[PDB]
Design a protein around this ligand. Structure first.
Ligand SMILES: *Cc1[nH]c(Cc2[nH]cc(CCC(=O)O)c2CC(=O)O)c(CCC(=O)O)c1CC(=O)O
Length: 290
């Protein structure tokens, strides 16, 4: 006579791996709950949750919409994985060692624009596929290197030595929420929220909250060359690095804010960058994306 928590999940191997990881972690609490996965886009999952067809969903935080519909909430952010972008080179060159005219594979304008801002003599080309697929294309096709999230490589079990070079935020500011998971549920589901609380990692949640406020006030998302990475410093301060880039890498807006309040920090970063023209650039890229 236990409540069975229905967890909706995307069909991919990464999404199901993340979903099962969360369920296994909640089971460590030894509380009287059962768990079941229902394979299920973001609108679809949120509708089913609002419809009570499912009780919760596990998303990569960088895939979460900046704005959740009324009634839903992020109920838990667990301990962050590696936040960094990772460079994997076919022949093992670091970024500064790649040959002139090297082609780096990524469909992310955030990633590509930042790389082009460092070296405009390389080329960024679209690529698709899960990690396994992109790694195969690196060996067999006309890419000299690809960019992947360190977090996805880790969660898929790839060795740390698969990575040629972990890119620090000073080279490539990560996508907002990269390496973090979001557990979404109904805001009034106090029983599930109580179960989720022990899995929540307050330091990760506070940093990501600052990133997400910046994202929301810039009206950012996946397709946008916008980036933000927050971290907790000794003493409780959050340091937020925020960035907006033109697709060609020749315009870079960058802002560093260190303070106590994640909402104030995120809001100030957006205010400063908006005043410099970064929001106009975001709007124009959105229009071109049609
Ligand atoms: C918004 C966006 N999504 C993806 C693809 C993606 N989403 C989640 C992951 C795994 C890591 C995580 O959960 O943090 C991935 C795969 C990955 O980042 O390697 C992207 C990247 C598209 C690409 O580079 O082609 C993005 C855009 C962005 O990172 O800004």
């Amino acid at each position: 006579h236990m409540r069975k928590i229905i967890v909706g999940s995307r069909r991919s191997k990464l999404a199901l791996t993340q979903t099962k990881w969360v369920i296994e972690q909640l089971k460590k609490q030894g509380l009287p709950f059962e768990f079941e996965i229902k394979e299920m886009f973001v609108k679809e999952i949120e509708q089913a949750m609002l419809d009570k067809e499912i009780d919760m969903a596990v998303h990569s935080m960088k895939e979460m919409p900046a704005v959740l519909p009324e009634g839903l909430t992020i109920g838990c952010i667990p301990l962050r994985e590696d936040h960094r972008d990772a460079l994997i080179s076919k022949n093992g060159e670091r970024f500064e060692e790649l040959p002139s005219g090297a082609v780096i594979g990524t469909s992310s304008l955030r990633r590509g624009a930042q790389l082009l801002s460092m070296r405009s003599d390389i080329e960024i080309k679209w690529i698709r596929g899960n990690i396994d697929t992109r790694l195969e294309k690196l060996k067999n096709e006309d890419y000299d290197a690809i960019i992947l999230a360190a977090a996805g490589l880790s969660r898929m079990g790839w060795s740390k030595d698969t990575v040629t070079q972990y890119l620090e935020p000073e080279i490539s500011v990560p996508a907002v929420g990269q390496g973090a998971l979001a557990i979404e549920c109904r805001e009034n589901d106090h029983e599930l929220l109580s179960l989720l609380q022990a899995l929540n990692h307050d330091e990760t949640a506070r940093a990501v909250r600052a990133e997400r406020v910046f994202l929301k006030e810039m009206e950012g998302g996946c397709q946008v060359p916008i980036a933000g990475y927050g971290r907790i410093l000794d003493g409780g301060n959050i340091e937020l690095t925020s960035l907006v880039a033109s697709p060609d890498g020749k315009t870079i807006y960058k802002e560093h804010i260190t303070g106590k309040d994640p909402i104030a920090i995120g809001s100030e970063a957006a205010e400063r960058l908006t005043s410099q023209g970064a929001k106009l650039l975001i709007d124009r890229v959105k229009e071109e994306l049609d």
